[PDB]
Design an enzyme around this catalytic site. Structure first.
Site, mmCIF file in Angstrom:
data_model
loop_
_atom_site.group_PDB
_atom_site.id
_atom_site.type_symbol
_atom_site.label_atom_id
_atom_site.label_comp_id
_atom_site.label_asym_id
_atom_site.label_seq_id
_atom_site.Cartn_x
_atom_site.Cartn_y
_atom_site.Cartn_z
ATOM 1 N N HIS A 41 0.976 -1.229 0.136
ATOM 2 C CA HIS A 41 -0.367 0.037 -0.381
ATOM 3 C C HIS A 41 1.122 1.034 0.244
ATOM 4 O O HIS A 41 0.361 2.111 0.324
ATOM 5 C CB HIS A 41 -0.865 0.032 1.835
ATOM 6 C CG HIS A 41 -1.381 -0.744 1.384
ATOM 7 N ND1 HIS A 41 -2.977 -1.700 0.363
ATOM 8 C CD2 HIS A 41 -1.506 -2.245 2.307
ATOM 9 C CE1 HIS A 41 -3.053 -2.658 1.348
ATOM 10 N NE2 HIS A 41 -2.584 -3.722 2.003
ATOM 11 N N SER A 109 -3.281 -7.824 -1.381
ATOM 12 C CA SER A 109 -4.905 -6.989 -0.386
ATOM 13 C C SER A 109 -5.313 -6.041 -1.378
ATOM 14 O O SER A 109 -4.329 -5.062 -2.477
ATOM 15 C CB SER A 109 -3.409 -5.973 0.971
ATOM 16 O OG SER A 109 -4.564 -5.066 1.368
ATOM 17 N N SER A 111 -7.489 -2.852 -1.669
ATOM 18 C CA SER A 111 -7.362 -1.629 -1.282
ATOM 19 C C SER A 111 -9.304 -1.012 -1.216
ATOM 20 O O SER A 111 -9.994 -1.356 -2.573
ATOM 21 C CB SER A 111 -7.020 -0.193 -1.527
ATOM 22 O OG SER A 111 -6.857 0.403 -0.872
ATOM 23 N N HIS A 129 -6.252 0.230 -5.276
ATOM 24 C CA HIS A 129 -4.788 -0.018 -6.548
ATOM 25 C C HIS A 129 -5.726 -2.051 -5.332
ATOM 26 O O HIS A 129 -5.690 -2.171 -4.409
ATOM 27 C CB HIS A 129 -3.828 0.293 -5.203
ATOM 28 C CG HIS A 129 -3.733 0.556 -4.289
ATOM 29 N ND1 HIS A 129 -4.211 1.765 -2.956
ATOM 30 C CD2 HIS A 129 -3.232 -0.628 -2.929
ATOM 31 C CE1 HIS A 129 -3.545 1.007 -2.027
ATOM 32 N NE2 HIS A 129 -3.771 0.098 -1.842
ATOM 33 N N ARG A 137 -2.121 -11.896 5.033
ATOM 34 C CA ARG A 137 -2.506 -12.729 4.084
ATOM 35 C C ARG A 137 -3.799 -13.334 5.419
ATOM 36 O O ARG A 137 -2.584 -13.817 6.006
ATOM 37 C CB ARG A 137 -1.837 -13.687 3.697
ATOM 38 C CG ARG A 137 -2.495 -14.456 2.359
ATOM 39 C CD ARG A 137 -1.916 -15.109 1.963
ATOM 40 N NE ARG A 137 -1.275 -16.013 2.846
ATOM 41 C CZ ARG A 137 -1.346 -17.470 3.038
ATOM 42 N NH1 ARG A 137 -3.030 -17.931 2.337
ATOM 43 N NH2 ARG A 137 -1.314 -18.214 3.734
ATOM 44 N N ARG A 138 -4.819 -12.929 5.697
ATOM 45 C CA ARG A 138 -6.131 -13.629 5.573
ATOM 46 C C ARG A 138 -6.489 -14.298 5.358
ATOM 47 O O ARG A 138 -6.206 -16.399 4.902
ATOM 48 C CB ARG A 138 -6.687 -12.897 6.601
ATOM 49 C CG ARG A 138 -5.695 -12.282 7.489
ATOM 50 C CD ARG A 138 -6.932 -11.155 8.418
ATOM 51 N NE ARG A 138 -6.417 -9.964 9.444
ATOM 52 C CZ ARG A 138 -6.911 -9.587 10.005
ATOM 53 N NH1 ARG A 138 -8.607 -9.847 10.166
ATOM 54 N NH2 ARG A 138 -6.662 -8.425 10.781
#
Ligand SMILES: O=C(O)c1ccc(NC(=O)c2cccc(CC3CCCCC3)n2)c(Nc2cccc(OC(F)(F)F)c2)c1
Length: 188
Positions: A41, A109, A111, A129, A137-138
């Site tokens: 990010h 991820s 956003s 993005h 990471r889940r």
């Protein structure tokens, strides 16, 4: 030219934060417009662009392209010459670049805006993005990096054939040359 794919985690206000359930944003999928692929990010780490965010059986699948020359050349050099980059990877891999991205940036991820703005009608774009992430990471799956878009999507048994076909239809229709040049610069 390098392709990436995998299931994403949907985060809002990342590294500032709230992980979202995939269903809270399914109403705004698919997203076939290019979104920038950044790192953790961070601004000015655009390394490529998304080629499609699709809701499939087991969540939101992402397919993107890594087009930044500066990033690819730097990553390739580290993969061929850095004992530190190769320490957590099996010995003597055929594709050290892919294995190192696979090992060091496993998370995708996505956003998003805050959920309080999704229950109502959102005024602007919901997604900003996608990020390659070393942590966090889940629900998402370990990102898969490869040279063929079909090969990447093939590595996921969680995607049926019909789904896979829907993905490659929008991926094959995007030429990586028409994409803008990412803004990544080496922080060395
Ligand atoms: O100068 C500094 O102060 C500075 C020092 C270190 C940095 N990185 C990490 O600590 C770090 C940790 C975990 C993963 C990654 C990304 C992969 C990229 C493939 C090769 C392995 C590493 N980086 C950064 N930040 C950073 C931003 C984006 C990309 C990046 O990797 C590279 F620079 F090699 F492109 C590093 C900056």
């Amino acid at each position: 030219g390098l392709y990436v794919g995998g299931f994403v985690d949907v985060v809002s206000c990342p590294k500032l934060e709230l992980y979202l359930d995939p269903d809270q944003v399914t109403d705004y999928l698919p997203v076939t417009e290019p979104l920038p692929i950044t790192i953790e990010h961070l601004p000015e780490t655009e390394v490529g662009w998304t080629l499609g965010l699709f809701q499939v059986s087991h969540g939101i699948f992402c397919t993107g392209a890594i087009t930044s020359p500066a990033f690819l050349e730097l990553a390739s050099r580290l993969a061929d010459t850095s004992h530190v980059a190769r320490a957590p990877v099996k010995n003597l891999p055929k594709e050290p670049l892919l294995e190192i991205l696979h090992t060091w940036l496993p998370g995708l991820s996505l956003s998003s805006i805050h959920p309080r703005e999704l229950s109502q009608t959102p005024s602007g774009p919901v997604f900003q993005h996608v990020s390659l992430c070393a942590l966090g990471r889940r629900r998402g799956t370990v990102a898969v990096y490869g040279h063929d878009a079909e090969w990447v999507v093939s590595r996921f048994s969680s995607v049926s054939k019909s789904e896979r076909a829907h993905i490659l239809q929008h991926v094959s229709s995007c030429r990586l040359e028409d994409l803008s040049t990412p803004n990544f610069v080496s922080p060395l």
